[PDB]
Symmetry: C3
Subunit: 274 residues, 3 copies
């Protein structure tokens, strides 16, 4: 794919997001993810997919704020009527027959964090993984699953903290809060994740699918709630207050590889109230 | 900076951040005055131009709230009723209104918060506790009733079944570090850093769009709060057991040893309960 | 107090210490299930002990898993505890969870499969840092866990960590089990007996109706519905009928399953070699 480099080692696929300049989630990333999910639904597809990033500093910084309609239209192609949202695409990711493992170095914010949250397991580099939900600070509630996943993983208090402060969390704090399964030393992370994927590679396909389906049924929101979250994000992200705050962010180097994106959580605290 | 302040709650507004300090001597028992003032504060905070964020703390040297005043239950329940509709005459329903406020609420804990005191903190949006001096507990079962103002609903969700059964059924006191490990508080913070930490959190949210804060909070609450019927059921059961013979006898024994005074029984109530003889 | 063939019981005031002792290796077989059914009946009485501490007499195991050579027999025993469609360890363990008596599982050594599910059905779990091991080997063999691990682990661990524990079928030490939420706390082995005795003692003088009321209210929020317990069992049964489970179970027996060898001592690892 244009934005996803795939290497298949047995029944384990390594899918690497490589969408220069900085791995924004735009229409091409979404299009290629839609195509990948279609492939991974095949009976003889890999049992396990490991997701990682080719970018030095980011997994995904967030969605491309200049292409919201465009990436939304790509996301719609994965679903049926009512599913024109990144949120419903990430729901399909969560329900995939393949076991998905997110391996995080560097920064994953906004829908970047939501992508990780939709995967089955998250393992993060202690030294360099950073998670955040900048959406509220910019001016919209998270629209692709953070509300649904974080509330269940973190519990009410910690989810309110993460979502409403829009602050950045290092890997150790993310582990303590439950946002990732575990923080692992950077030097051990690749081997640790490869080993886990190798565990499951030899297990009966139907057992993996049955157990995952059963756990998902208990722990995923209903589609109505996913669609409601997306609709409210889609409304507020087009609103005047978000326009003004995003305009200030653009002046300060938003969607460039600089201080604003590297330390976006901090940057939001300096924005003038609208 | 116009904002109401009350006999038992010292409230002041600095921009869009309200600081509200509970100060109800002699020892911050949740009595009718505290409940009345909290009812009034929650009504004020429903206004669209009200503060984005409220920081709650305590003026008391040793307690946030020790628990409810067990000598004034009908009187404080009557005050609590004024916050809601028919069937909402309970601290549980008052604390549900607190949870659902448009304002983001931060509980800053030093010293002891037990019973309905812990339940107040649990109803707030975020809890940050002094590592050195914060203590949490649910003494209700040890006295002889299940918690009646939300601890069952909140702790089961935050702690999970096993740890909630441990906390509620043992009525033991938890220090800040263990409270954090169990999920009763968001984080334990060194005492010397706690004020600045909480101020920073509040300052973050102070400049964020009001509608985004409210939208996100409301959606999170929808997933994680009980239904009103469950809150009312929790309250009903507590109000009846606090009048059964065992609670009356054990409460009387506790009063004999200094319950509702600033002494060993209240400073270490978790321990006191374990030594009461059946 | 009553002692049983496989459950050695001592009553001290209002605290019952019930020790599982079913040689050669504490498999959950028909005798264990029979005796557990009888014990649950006794513990329903108004003047039963307020608290029960469960432990094991076996040097290496709490319960390794069920005796897979006696499935009809132990199932028939479990059936006696419930109504139509309750002939499952899942429903038996639900009855355990709903007991008026407070149950504390004190874990040394290995508890896997339905052994872990027994512990999960108890009210509190405290584990020896040095020697407690937990695992759900079911997916590795080829079915989702059928006796409550799906329902309990998803709630206690959250989606990500539950998917990890269930899909990997890996063994978890006490410290990791505590971090993930599978046990309440990990305690040094030398302190574990005193710690658990202290917890039981806290509750010994508490009003019976308060303990029962609070436990019932917590269970109502945190237990699955009976239909979901029945469905967990049925899903396990569908997959267990399949060729892969039959084949992999046979290979495990060929490698010393249900004997005190490497396969049972280190079952998590053993599944990876199939
Ligand atoms: Na948790």
């Amino acid at each position: 794919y244009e934005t996803i480099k795939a290497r298949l080692d047995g029944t384990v696929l390594s899918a690497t997001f490589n969408a220069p300049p900085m791995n924004l989630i735009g229409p091409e990333v979404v299009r290629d993810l839609v195509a990948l999910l279609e492939e991974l639904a095949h009976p003889t597809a890999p049992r396990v997919v490991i997701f990682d990033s080719a970018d030095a500093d980011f997994f995904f910084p967030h969605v491309d704020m200049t292409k919201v309609p465009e990436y939304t239209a790509e996301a719609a192609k994965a679903g049926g009527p009512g599913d024109a949202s990144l949120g419903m695409l990430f729901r399909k990711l969560s329900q995939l027959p393949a076991v998905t493992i997110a391996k995080l170095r560097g920064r994953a914010r906004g829908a970047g964090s939501e992508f990780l949250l939709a995967c089955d397991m998250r393992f993060a580099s202690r030294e360099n993984a950073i998670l955040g939900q900048p959406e509220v600070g910019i001016g919209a509630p998270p629209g692709a699953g953070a509300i649904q996943h974080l509330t269940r993983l973190l519990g009410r208090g910690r989810a309110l903290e993460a979502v409403l402060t829009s602050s950045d969390f290092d890997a150790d704090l993310a582990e303590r809060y439950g946002w990732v399964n575990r923080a692992v030393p950077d030097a051990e992370l690749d081997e640790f994740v490869a080993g886990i994927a190798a565990r499951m590679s030899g297990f009966p396909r139907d057992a993996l699918i049955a157990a995952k389906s059963a756990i998902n049924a208990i722990s995923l929101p209903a589609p109505a709630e996913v669609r409601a979250d997306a609709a409210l994000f889609q409304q507020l992200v087009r609103g005047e207050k978000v326009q003004q705050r995003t305009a200030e962010l653009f002046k300060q180097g938003f969607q460039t590889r600089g201080a604003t994106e590297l330390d976006l959580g901090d940057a939001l605290g300096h924005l003038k109230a609208v």
